[PDB]
Paper text:
Cystinuria is caused by mutations in system b0,+, which is a Na+-independent cystine/dibasic amino acid exchanger localized at brush border cells in the kidney and intestine. Mutations of the regulatory glycoprotein rBAT and the amino acid transporter b0,+AT, which constitute system b0,+, are linked to type I and non-type I cystinuria respectively and they exhibit distinct phenotypes due to protein trafficking defects or catalytic inactivation. Here, using electron cryo-microscopy and biochemistry, we discover that Ca2+ mediates higher-order assembly of system b0,+. Ca2+ stabilizes the interface between two rBAT molecules, leading to super-dimerization of b0,+AT–rBAT, which in turn facilitates N-glycan maturation and protein trafficking.
Single-particle analysis indicated that the two b0,+AT–rBAT subcomplexes are linked together with substantial flexibility, which was also evident in the human complex that showed a blurred TMD map in the consensus 3D refinement. To account for this flexibility, we performed multi-body refinement, taking individual heterodimers as rigid bodies moving relative to each other. This analysis not only revealed the swinging motions of b0,+AT relative to the rigid rBAT core, but also yielded an improved map for the individual b0,+AT–rBAT subcomplex at 3.0-Å nominal resolution. On the extracellular side, EL2 of b0,+AT is disulfide-bonded to the linker that connects TM1′ to the ectodomain of rBAT. Within the membrane, TM1′ and TM4 form extensive helix-helix packing interactions. We identified one cholesterol molecule bound tightly at this interface, which is in an equivalent position to that seen in LAT1–CD98hc10, suggesting a conserved cholesterol-binding site in the HATs. On the cytoplasmic side, the N-terminal helix (NH) of rBAT interacts with the C-terminal helix (CH) of b0,+AT. Our b0,+AT structure adopts the inward-facing conformation without any substrate bound. As in other LeuT-fold transporters, a putative substrate-binding site of b0,+AT is formed between the hash and bundle domains.
Residue numbers in the entry:
A (entry chain A): 63 to 685
B (entry chain B): 29 to 483
Write the structure that this text describes.
Amino acid sequence: RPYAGMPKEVLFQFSGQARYRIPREVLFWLTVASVLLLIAATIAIIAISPKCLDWWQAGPMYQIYPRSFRDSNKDGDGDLKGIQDKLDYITTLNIKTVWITSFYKSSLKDFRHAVEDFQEIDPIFGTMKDFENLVAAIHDKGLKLIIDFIPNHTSDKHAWFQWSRNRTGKYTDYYIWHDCNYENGTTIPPNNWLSVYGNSSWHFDEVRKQCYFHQFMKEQPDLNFRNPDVQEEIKEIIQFWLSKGVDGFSFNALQYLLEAKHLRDEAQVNKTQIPDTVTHYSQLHHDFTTTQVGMHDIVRSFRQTMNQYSREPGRYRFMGTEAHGESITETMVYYGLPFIQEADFPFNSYLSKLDKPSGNSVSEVITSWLENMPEGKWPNWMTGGPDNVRLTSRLGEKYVNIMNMLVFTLPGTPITYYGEEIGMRNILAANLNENYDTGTLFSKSPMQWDNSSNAGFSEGNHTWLPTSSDYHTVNVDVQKTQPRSALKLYQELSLLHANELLLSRGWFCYLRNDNHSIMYTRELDGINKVFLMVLNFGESSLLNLKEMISNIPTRVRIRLSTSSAYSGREVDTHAVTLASGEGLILEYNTGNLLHRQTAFKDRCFVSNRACYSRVLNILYSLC
Amino acid sequence: ELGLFSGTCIIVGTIIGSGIFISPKSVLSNMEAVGPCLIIWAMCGVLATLGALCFAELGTMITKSGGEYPYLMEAFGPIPAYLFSWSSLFVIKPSSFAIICLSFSEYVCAPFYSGCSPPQVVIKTLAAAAILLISTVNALSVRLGSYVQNVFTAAKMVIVVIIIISGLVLLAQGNTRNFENSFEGASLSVGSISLALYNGLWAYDGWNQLNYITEELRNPFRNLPLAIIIGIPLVTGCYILMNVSYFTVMTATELLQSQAVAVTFGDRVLYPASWIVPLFVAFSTIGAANGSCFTAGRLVFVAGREGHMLKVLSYISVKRLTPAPAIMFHSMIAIIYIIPGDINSLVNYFSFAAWLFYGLTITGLIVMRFTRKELKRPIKVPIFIPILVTLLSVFLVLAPIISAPAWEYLYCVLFMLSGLVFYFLFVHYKFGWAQKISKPLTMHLQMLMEVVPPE
Ligand SMILES: CCCCCCCC/C=C\CCCCCCCC(=O)O[C@H](COC(=O)CCCCCCCCCCCCCCC)COP(=O)([O-])OCC[N+](C)(C)C
Ligand SMILES: *[C@@H]1O[C@H](CO)[C@@H](O[C@@H]2O[C@H](CO)[C@@H](O)[C@H](O)[C@H]2NC(C)=O)[C@H](O)[C@H]1NC(C)=O
Ligand SMILES: *[C@@H]1O[C@H](CO)[C@@H](O[C@@H]2O[C@H](CO)[C@@H](O)[C@H](O)[C@H]2NC(C)=O)[C@H](O)[C@H]1NC(C)=O
Ligand SMILES: CC(C)CCC[C@@H](C)[C@H]1CC[C@H]2[C@@H]3CC=C4C[C@@H](O)CC[C@]4(C)[C@H]3CC[C@]12C
Ligand SMILES: CC(C)CCC[C@@H](C)[C@H]1CC[C@H]2[C@@H]3CC=C4C[C@@H](O)CC[C@]4(C)[C@H]3CC[C@]12C
Ligand SMILES: *[C@@H]1O[C@H](CO)[C@@H](O)[C@H](O)[C@H]1NC(C)=O
Ligand SMILES: *[C@@H]1O[C@H](CO)[C@@H](O)[C@H](O)[C@H]1NC(C)=O
Ligand SMILES: *[C@@H]1O[C@H](CO)[C@@H](O)[C@H](O)[C@H]1NC(C)=O
Ligand SMILES: *[C@@H]1O[C@H](CO)[C@@H](O)[C@H](O)[C@H]1NC(C)=O
Ligand SMILES: [Ca+2]
């Protein structure tokens, strides 16, 4: 009856019900149930997957002082052509963002600035086409470029001010003017307001016959941000630089934007002081010249102008601000509100203030930023800047390595100042014939590249600033051959921080710490492996980790060390020793994570919680 | 009957598929410069014309129903004809179905993962759900096969002109910075040039299945070599005029970042409605997959006569006249392909096996024309075009394996030789016990799946 070759009519007898009927519909309904259970499973994975980290959260920034990086045409001043030559050195550090401080056409290159044209490059840095070739060379390497912006004041040689003193057109109110009595060279100002660098904050103008306001030196009149004409000018400069491909800005001197309209006198710190000897900025309470009422809606307006360019995916424009030196709760307002967006993060300069390497001095900065921060925000850690003594001269050479391991294992974005990866130091003296701030000038020495004329920075006769004397031992060429150098460790940390998935979005549980030592772990849920960083800022120690963590085995592997002697050597948890500036990245496996317990819910921090799935190999935010 | 203008309109719509949306990323990651990767689309675009012209010769002189299986039977004997029927059932046809459905989930899930790459589990769970749905619809019905075809080839051409017009208008506005200093980092090598011809030629897949149109052509012999030498060279001109429209908008460093190249383009140029590109490309890519599943039952019928492939595969279901055993076996092999590999490791695996049989065919063209066969051939091609296609394909099959060896080639060579083993132990020797494993298998399958021999 089978007779394998079977036309229509015969097999309809067999295929009716006997046994082969129920498999047909049960297999046909299986493939249908699965098709709508795979398009249902992919929707359930796209929904629970958390947003990936932007380019400003993913990798370290690298702050360059453009006049001291690399000189191309032997004139003694670095320029934008020399920054472009060294872009292949910057990508061996695994840098993601190159932050170039201000290069606009300036009449004063310090004291926070004096710009003559917000849309030109200063001649000593190159020309407008040298910038477009650098922005192209940066994007082709996969890097991003953010630049300094300071919108509070201009130079008194700016075209806007030359028209304003002439009362020309609409420019008569671009600046803050007021009437003042001027006889025999001595002026009485409209009030007792002081400059930030210390003197009467009003200055008489001979052409206008009025006084103009300036927070900084007399060469920097303050723009009047209360009239809408000035805000549309600052809106076109933000639009001019974003069209050239700049990936974001760093706004400076933001608390000085607005001032009180009533122009009433401040309150003295020492009330019983004679009102003609108050000439120091610190002798007044500054309630009418900093952080006025409508100041945050101006900064939120800059953020909307930058949103017209950050819509296409992969080209988000970063906005960061500098922090208020005195307050930390005033700094956290720049993070914005859950419904009004603002700076992506304000720059944390509190690590750059430590002058003595103590364990509780560093521990206080870490917990002060992380607990004061809003919920789903992103931290950042900046251990140096152009305006403070370099790390090797502030703390000592023994703390260069322990300090790079600190900011690369903490949550958030580490921001590096040029020359901090090789352990540069301040110069001892210089003779400059320009108007520079001699208190903060010695941390801008030219970059030391190798053993040559001027450390390989200029190839010319002279440099704008003398290089440090000991550039024969500390420079890039020597340090990238040595096996255990500050540059070699820096390239190991930025690579470990880049591709770990545990350092970028793992929890941060800050275990207890006595003075002279800091311990914290980074852990994710489905990873089944935790990092433990033990950093010793003290004299020396032999500390038993089995009592402290209560989660650690008795034999752990050293993933990294600052003295680099412990490349892969395993140690005993009972007795680990740390030699006064030693840091270890211990790494072990465990199923009991510290943030899941109840005693540690008060001291674990994460920005956007996300657990890990081993079977799917994805992050998912549902857990 | 269909005229010459329609004589090309069928072939041009046939060539342009989902290859132009996925290959640019892969051909550029091997040329490294905008300049050379523009000559690859022309070099492989010309090499696809000489291929389709040589196939016009065999298509007219042999004049048999089989697609390419006859051409190897007429020249070399029964072993290459079988070896091709073996690979075109386990290698060429299933993997080309897995690349089209792997490239449809790259475009559906790319917008929901803006800024970064989606996980591998999402672009495989969505591809496995497209293979099962495309192979189930084409088994339950035939009208629904051709119901949505003419609309799916509209969306395919609507986008092709939107990308071109936009990429030309932007070129008038002077956005010339990308190809100003081309050729500067060109890594020309037998390693890169071969691996970049694979991905460039995959966008031309569909030039061999172009001989069926002669039956309705008004004047076939006079117009078909014309409809080919003006149809495909019109398409390669529409590829370099579409790959140029990518580099006008974005740079060579941002191309390699995204797998969905046209999605990166619609965000940069068409912001008010940028969802149009991932929506229209998902239409055309799922339409080109519908064309692959339709032809699965074609070759198994012609090879089912000569007792090379199992005859049960050509059986048709009675309730719906659809080759159910051919389809559900054609897709079940594809599911096993999307699991291990991804698009780039499958375009190499596919264009490797496909190009050795593409060579053996057009060598059989001259070999039959040189010595063995003296029958009349209606249209004749010059002698210099076939010797080029074979000397090119011998470079395409043999350079990648020696210069850039990979584990994908090994599994490809082990598949054909495994079929060579099935030749002697199953069809060449005709063992006694070999029969009693076949007969109870076919009708039980017929019993379970209610399918019936076609005629
Ligand atoms: C033929 C046409 C096919 C479709 C074409 C394309 C269609 C779309 C075209 C175009 C996209 C339109 C614009 C979208 C903009 C972004 C919107 C967005 O992110 O919304 C999310 C909605 O939340 C969700 O859960 C979205 C789920 C999406 C599921 C997709 C379909 C899968 C199956 C397709 C059919 C397969 C059929 C196979 C058989 C034929 C936001 O949610 P969230 O929680 O805020 O963010 C979560 C995700 N991140 C951002 C964190 C990463
Ligand atoms: C305000 O400006 C006056 C200048 O008019 C400063 O006084 C001079 O300070 C320098 C310091 O290097 C002395 O050498 C001069 O002798 C001072 N001039 C006179 C007339 O005494 C004054 O210090 C400024 N106030 C500050 C900085 O708080
Ligand atoms: C605040 O400044 C006043 C001066 O304006 C200080 O008072 C005394 O001032 C007279 C002025 O002739 C001095 O001779 C005294 O020596 C001052 N007393 C002191 C220094 O104790 C007052 O003390 C100042 N207060 C603070 C807190 O510094
Ligand atoms: C037809 C009926 C009876 C059975 C259908 C089973 C199908 C839906 C199952 C069987 C094996 C499965 C695959 C197994 C493993 C993987 C790899 C993973 O990284 C993505 C999903 C993927 C690719 C699965 C997709 C769904 C799948 C193809
Ligand atoms: C079959 C095709 C022509 C149908 C689509 C027609 C419309 C929607 C298309 C055809 C050409 C297109 C234009 C081509 C180029 C540009 C320049 C670009 O900087 C902005 C979009 C813009 C202005 C496009 C807008 C949409 C457009 C007008
Ligand atoms: C200001 O007015 C004076 C007097 O006429 C003139 O010489 C000068 O050029 C003017 N400057 C500007 C900037 O208008
Ligand atoms: C005039 O100038 C002299 C300068 O020595 C000064 O002493 C005097 O107070 C001034 N007079 C007025 C009224 O400003
Ligand atoms: C500087 O480094 C070079 C290696 O590039 C070395 O040859 C030279 O001796 C060094 N000079 C000094 C003074 O150490
Ligand atoms: C530096 O001094 C030497 C000494 O002759 C001179 O040749 C050279 O030109 C000087 N450098 C510059 C930049 O002028
Ligand atoms: Ca101001």
